[PDB]
Amino acid sequence: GAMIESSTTIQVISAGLPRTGTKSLKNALEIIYHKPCYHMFEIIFNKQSDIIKWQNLIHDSHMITTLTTKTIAIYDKLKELLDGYIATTDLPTCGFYKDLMNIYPNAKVLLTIRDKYDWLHSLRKVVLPKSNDPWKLKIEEGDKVLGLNSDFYKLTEDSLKFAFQKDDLNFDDDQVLLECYDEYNRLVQETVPSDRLLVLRLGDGWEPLCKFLNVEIPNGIDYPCVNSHHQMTQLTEQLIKYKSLDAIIHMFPDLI
Numbered sequence: 001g002a003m004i005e006s007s008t009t010i011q012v013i014s015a016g017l018p019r020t021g022t023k024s025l026k027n028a029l030e031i032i033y034h035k036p037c038y039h040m041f042e043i044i045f046n047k048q049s050d051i052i053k054w055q056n057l058i059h060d061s062h063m064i065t066t067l068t069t070k071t072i073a074i075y076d077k078l079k080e081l082l083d084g085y086i087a088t089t090d091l092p093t094c095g096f097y098k099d100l101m102n103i104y105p106n107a108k109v110l111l112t113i114r115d116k117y118d119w120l121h122s123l124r125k126v127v128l129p130k131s132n133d134p135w136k137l138k139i140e141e142g143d144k145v146l147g148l149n150s151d152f153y154k155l156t157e158d159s160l161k162f163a164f165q166k167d168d169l170n171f172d173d174d175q176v177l178l179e180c181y182d183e184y185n186r187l188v189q190e191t192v193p194s195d196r197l198l199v200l201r202l203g204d205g206w207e208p209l210c211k212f213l214n215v216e217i218p219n220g221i222d223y224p225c226v227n228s229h230h231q232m233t234q235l236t237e238q239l240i241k242y243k244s245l246d247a248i249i250h251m252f253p254d255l256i
């Protein structure tokens with residue numbers, strides 16, 4: 001197909017929850033658009049100063065009405081955070097999908113989904129281990145190597161609670177999490193006009209995504225398959241062993 005000059009503004013809003021293929025999708029959108037896509041990895045590796053800005057935004061977000069003066073202030077901060085990016089995926093952004101749709105009226109919406117039990121299992125190994133899981137101590141040790149402190153964990157928890165619209169949340173309760181998951185995904189498909197939504201099940205690959213976005217399938221490039229919990233476990237253990245990211249980053253080419 002012909003090469004056309006794409007606008008550097010949010011073109012795709014992904015509502016999918018963490019551990020549903022968001023990093024592969026991030027990589028895929030960057031392969032298509034040749035501009036950055038927002039993701040929790042963007043915060044961790046490139047923009048840790050954003051952490052307090054997202055935390056502030058979530059704090060102020062109860063005061064959003066579907067427009068109040070207070071809404072415009074929030075929308076302005078969201079636009080600021082996302083300047084220069086062509087898409088959003090993952091926490092903390094995914095819970096803001098309705099507001100992003102208002103801010104970027106010409107952006108299309110994605111929902112990444114998968115088997116709820118596979119999701120929970122993945123979440124417990126990477127994002128939200130149970131309190132008494134010994135692996136939690138390893139995650140915390142590796143996170144310190146990355147410069148991540150208590151504020152980072154607060155942002156993760158608060159952004160999840162925001163996505164699920166819960167004032168609080170027993171993170172150690174599998175049944176609660178499974179029910180939030182199903183309710184979240186249900187609500188997205190009820191809220192977004194079907195014309196503006198594409199639901200992507202893990203494994204779907206390039207084809208429905210590229211059709212939805214009116215772009216050619218990238219020539220000779222397989223759809224990304226990254227960020228497995230097995231790989232994240234290896235990253236954690238290597239961070240602990242070497243005590244720096246730059247010592248090991250050559251070992252994790254497409255993940256980081």
Ligand SMILES: Nc1ncnc2c1ncn2[C@@H]1O[C@H](COP(=O)(O)O)[C@@H](OP(=O)(O)O)[C@H]1O
Nearest residue numbers: 018019020021022023024122224225227228229
């Ligand atoms: N192209 C693909 N096909 C199948 N699974 C994929 C995939 N890309 C990512 N995944 C899976 O999606 C999860 C990562 O999601 P995220 O990037 O949102 O955190 C991982 O699940 P597992 O932890 O079960 O391996 C990963 O294996």
Ligand SMILES: CC(C)NC[C@H]1CCc2cc(CO)c([N+](=O)[O-])cc2N1
Nearest residue numbers: 018040091127139142143156235236
């Ligand atoms: C020990 C290291 C590997 N921990 C990985 C980092 C970096 C990867 C990571 C990703 C997410 C979600 O995309 C979350 N999260 O929302 O809790 C946390 C983290 N933490």
